[PDB]
């Protein structure tokens, strides 16, 4: 099967954007990593 494939990278709890481990604020909505 070729099922779609999915480390400090975090999904914003507010807007769901995936953010780099280097940042602590969401690059899109500026809320802070929980």
């Amino acid at each position: 099967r070729f099922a779609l494939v999915t480390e400090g990278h975090w999904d914003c709890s507010i807007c769901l954007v995936r953010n780099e481990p280097t940042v602590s604020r969401c690059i899109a909505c500026q809320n802070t990593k929980s």
Partner: protein
């Protein structure tokens, strides 16, 4: 964690963006409000032959009626839908402006163009006009949010581009709010015919 894409849904006010995204029942019940940007993010799951895909659709709170949207709305957008109203020519005329804004902050993300409200007899923007101004890399679909007509097609096209798999399929339709108006099959057959002839015309 899951396969998901940020999808920005843009277009003039009153074209049906909110009505359209809301057809996906689970995406509505699980939507998330971003207070800092005035956005409702709808997580829309679609089940493909290779597993589930989530389009996190960013829906405005009407701010588009008064000016441009802030950069945060577009940041990390991986795909987009540009919507206009077939019963209002000005919404089509503004399509290139939305396109420009998207490419400024997002560049060559896959984009689908949707002409909404095709359930209305008195259509004004017709297949001839849209196919004459067809732009490469910009797939188009007729849609009717209130009737669920062609609801899945923008998302299927985007999923194929994003995954890079021309043979991706949805194995089942998502649970959609029951149609509030009927899409007359005759109009559907006509608009579909008008679109095919206009695309294969010599």
């Amino acid at each position: 964690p899951q396969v998901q894409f940020k999808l920005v849904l843009v277009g003039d006010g009153g074209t049906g963006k909110t009505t359209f995204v809301k057809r996906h029942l689970t995406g509505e019940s699980e939507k998330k409000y971003v207070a800092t940007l005035g956005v409702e993010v709808h997580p829309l799951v679609f089940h493909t032959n290779r597993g589930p895909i989530k389009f996190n659709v960013w829906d405005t709170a009407g701010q588009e009626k008064f000016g441009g949207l802030r950069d945060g709305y577009y940041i990390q957008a991986q795909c987009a839908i540009i919507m206009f109203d077939v019963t209002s020519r000005v919404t089509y005329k503004n399509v290139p402006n939305w396109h420009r804004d998207l490419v400024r902050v997002c560049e060559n993300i896959p984009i689908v163009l949707c002409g909404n409200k095709v359930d209305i007899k008195d259509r004004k923007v017709k297949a001839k006009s849209i196919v004459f101004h067809r732009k490469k890399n910009l797939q188009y679909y007729d849609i009717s949010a209130k009737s669920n007509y062609n609801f899945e097609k923008p998302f299927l096209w985007l999923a194929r581009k994003l995954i890079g798999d021309p043979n991706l399929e949805f194995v089942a339709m998502p649970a959609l709010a029951p149609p509030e108006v009927v899409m007359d099959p005759a109009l559907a057959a006509q608009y579909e015919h008008d679109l095919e002839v206009a695309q294969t015309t010599a």
